[PDB]
Design an enzyme around this catalytic site. Structure first.
Site, PDB file in Angstrom:
ATOM      1  N   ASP A   1      -7.346 -11.406  -6.945  1.00 13.88           N
ATOM      2  CA  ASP A   1      -8.339 -10.332  -6.989  1.00 13.88           C
ATOM      3  C   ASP A   1      -8.973 -10.086  -8.365  1.00 13.88           C
ATOM      4  O   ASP A   1      -8.390  -9.457  -9.227  1.00 13.88           O
ATOM      5  CB  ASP A   1      -7.683  -9.071  -6.436  1.00 13.88           C
ATOM      6  CG  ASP A   1      -8.646  -7.943  -6.243  1.00 13.88           C
ATOM      7  OD1 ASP A   1      -9.841  -8.094  -6.566  1.00 13.88           O
ATOM      8  OD2 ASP A   1      -8.192  -6.881  -5.758  1.00 13.88           O
TER       9      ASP A   1
HETATM   10  C1  LIG Z   1     -15.008  -1.085  -1.094  1.00 12.46           C
HETATM   11  C2  LIG Z   1     -14.388  -2.486  -0.887  1.00 12.46           C
HETATM   12  C3  LIG Z   1     -14.217  -3.062  -2.303  1.00 12.46           C
HETATM   13  C4  LIG Z   1     -13.014  -2.317  -0.159  1.00 12.46           C
HETATM   14  N1  LIG Z   1     -12.045  -3.418  -0.377  1.00 12.46           N
HETATM   15  C5  LIG Z   1     -11.053  -3.270  -1.452  1.00 12.46           C
HETATM   16  O1  LIG Z   1     -11.078  -2.268  -2.099  1.00 12.46           O
HETATM   17  C6  LIG Z   1      -9.973  -4.361  -1.744  1.00 12.46           C
HETATM   18  N2  LIG Z   1      -9.661  -4.299  -3.284  1.00 12.46           N
HETATM   19  C7  LIG Z   1     -10.662  -4.653  -4.255  1.00 12.46           C
HETATM   20  O2  LIG Z   1     -11.721  -5.005  -3.911  1.00 12.46           O
HETATM   21  C8  LIG Z   1     -10.283  -4.551  -5.720  1.00 12.46           C
HETATM   22  O3  LIG Z   1     -10.830  -5.639  -6.382  1.00 12.46           O
HETATM   23  C9  LIG Z   1     -10.746  -3.167  -6.235  1.00 12.46           C
HETATM   24  C10 LIG Z   1     -12.201  -3.050  -6.694  1.00 12.46           C
HETATM   25  C11 LIG Z   1     -12.459  -1.554  -6.917  1.00 12.46           C
HETATM   26  C12 LIG Z   1     -11.975  -0.878  -8.203  1.00 12.46           C
HETATM   27  C13 LIG Z   1     -12.217   0.621  -8.436  1.00 12.46           C
HETATM   28  C14 LIG Z   1     -12.984   1.425  -7.362  1.00 12.46           C
HETATM   29  C15 LIG Z   1     -13.480   0.741  -6.064  1.00 12.46           C
HETATM   30  C16 LIG Z   1     -13.209  -0.756  -5.851  1.00 12.46           C
HETATM   31  N3  LIG Z   1      -9.856  -2.922  -7.345  1.00 12.46           N
HETATM   32  C17 LIG Z   1      -8.895  -1.847  -7.270  1.00 12.46           C
HETATM   33  O4  LIG Z   1      -8.824  -1.100  -6.341  1.00 12.46           O
HETATM   34  C18 LIG Z   1      -7.987  -1.756  -8.498  1.00 12.46           C
HETATM   35  N4  LIG Z   1      -8.319  -0.587  -9.304  1.00 12.46           N
HETATM   36  C19 LIG Z   1      -8.713  -0.782 -10.696  1.00 12.46           C
HETATM   37  O5  LIG Z   1      -8.726  -1.879 -11.182  1.00 12.46           O
HETATM   38  C20 LIG Z   1      -9.102   0.498 -11.487  1.00 12.46           C
HETATM   39  N5  LIG Z   1      -8.494   0.567 -12.829  1.00 12.46           N
HETATM   40  C21 LIG Z   1     -10.640   0.531 -11.656  1.00 12.46           C
HETATM   41  C22 LIG Z   1     -11.363   1.896 -11.704  1.00 12.46           C
HETATM   42  C23 LIG Z   1     -12.902   1.936 -11.860  1.00 12.46           C
HETATM   43  C24 LIG Z   1     -13.720   0.621 -11.979  1.00 12.46           C
HETATM   44  C25 LIG Z   1     -12.998  -0.750 -11.932  1.00 12.46           C
HETATM   45  C26 LIG Z   1     -11.466  -0.786 -11.769  1.00 12.46           C
HETATM   46  C27 LIG Z   1      -6.458  -1.872  -8.220  1.00 12.46           C
HETATM   47  C28 LIG Z   1      -5.894  -0.539  -7.671  1.00 12.46           C
HETATM   48  C29 LIG Z   1      -6.206  -3.001  -7.174  1.00 12.46           C
HETATM   49  C30 LIG Z   1      -5.759  -2.264  -9.548  1.00 12.46           C
HETATM   50  C31 LIG Z   1      -8.232  -3.821  -3.622  1.00 12.46           C
HETATM   51  S1  LIG Z   1      -7.577  -3.184  -2.210  1.00 12.46           S
HETATM   52  C32 LIG Z   1      -8.557  -4.164  -1.074  1.00 12.46           C
HETATM   53  C33 LIG Z   1      -8.639  -3.479   0.304  1.00 12.46           C
HETATM   54  C34 LIG Z   1      -7.927  -5.560  -0.931  1.00 12.46           C
END
Ligand SMILES: CC(C)CNC(=O)[C@H]1N(C(=O)[C@@H](O)[C@H](Cc2ccccc2)NC(=O)[C@@H](NC(=O)[C@@H](N)c2ccccc2)C(C)(C)C)CSC1(C)C
Lengths: 116, 116
Positions: free
Chosen positions: B32
């Site tokens: 990711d």
């Molecule tokens: C809206 C779409 C992107 C939904 N899918 C997802 O969210 C999928 N993920 C993703 O797509 C991830 O790459 C996600 C991108 C994201 C970061 C911050 C707000 C919104 C989206 N990253 C995170 O959620 C990550 N949060 C962060 O890295 C956080 N420090 C942050 C805060 C503000 C801007 C950039 C980063 C962690 C919890 C995994 C470490 C992780 S969980 C998932 C279901 C596999």
């Protein structure tokens, strides 16, 4: 390009996004292999356009109201490529103005992850 | 290896993860580039491990309870690398037991995104 990965710097690109509901705008977007579907800020759409209700699972929990789904395809042009990415549907950020290029767009890019 | 990107198929990898609080275990982790920091399941730890409280922002919301921080470094072995990735700290998912390799680990094995 080759984009190096670094915890301290988010991997970003400038993308020209055409929602087909107003004039195309160039925005900065996170390149995200963990996203199934691309996210566009609501600001990029005209005020009256029909969107669909959607539920999204993310790291903070399940949200019913933060994101919508588009009614029209979205076109995205990336700075190096002449061919528009055409997305049948994507997510719309009604709140936090997130712009995130996910695997739907990266596929049409021929984007890969490379681990030596 | 080269990992192609497809909205219908999550890019996942087998990672042997050593928490240093019990023996090394295999999990299947999402690769990711939108994750600042790696996330591992609480299920890798025995009941009484000292973890720190932390606040994390994701697509689901801001949460102060779903994730904790490790007290000790985490060792991660990927199938195609002999040298362990050593994360000084990472996130621990207490709620859903997700496994997510983020840019912290991907930097240490020289992972890149490549867009032709
Ligand atoms: C809206 C779409 C992107 C939904 N899918 C997802 O969210 C999928 N993920 C993703 O797509 C991830 O790459 C996600 C991108 C994201 C970061 C911050 C707000 C919104 C989206 N990253 C995170 O959620 C990550 N949060 C962060 O890295 C956080 N420090 C942050 C805060 C503000 C801007 C950039 C980063 C962690 C919890 C995994 C470490 C992780 S969980 C998932 C279901 C596999």
């Amino acid at each position: 390009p080759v984009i190096p990965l670094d915890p301290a710097r988010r991997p970003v690109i400038k993308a020209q996004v055409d929602t087909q509901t107003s004039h195309p705008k160039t925005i900065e977007a996170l390149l995200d292999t963990g996203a199934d579907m691309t996210v566009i800020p609501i600001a990029l759409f005209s005020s009256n356009t029909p969107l669909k209700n959607t539920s999204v699972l993310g790291a903070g929990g399940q949200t019913q109201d933060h994101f919508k789904l588009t009614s029209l395809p979205v076109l995205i042009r990336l700075p190096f490529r002449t061919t528009p990415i055409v997305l049948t549907s994507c997510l719309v950020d009604t709140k936090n103005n997130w712009a995130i290029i996910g695997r739907d767009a990266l596929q049409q890019c021929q984007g890969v992850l490379y681990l030596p």
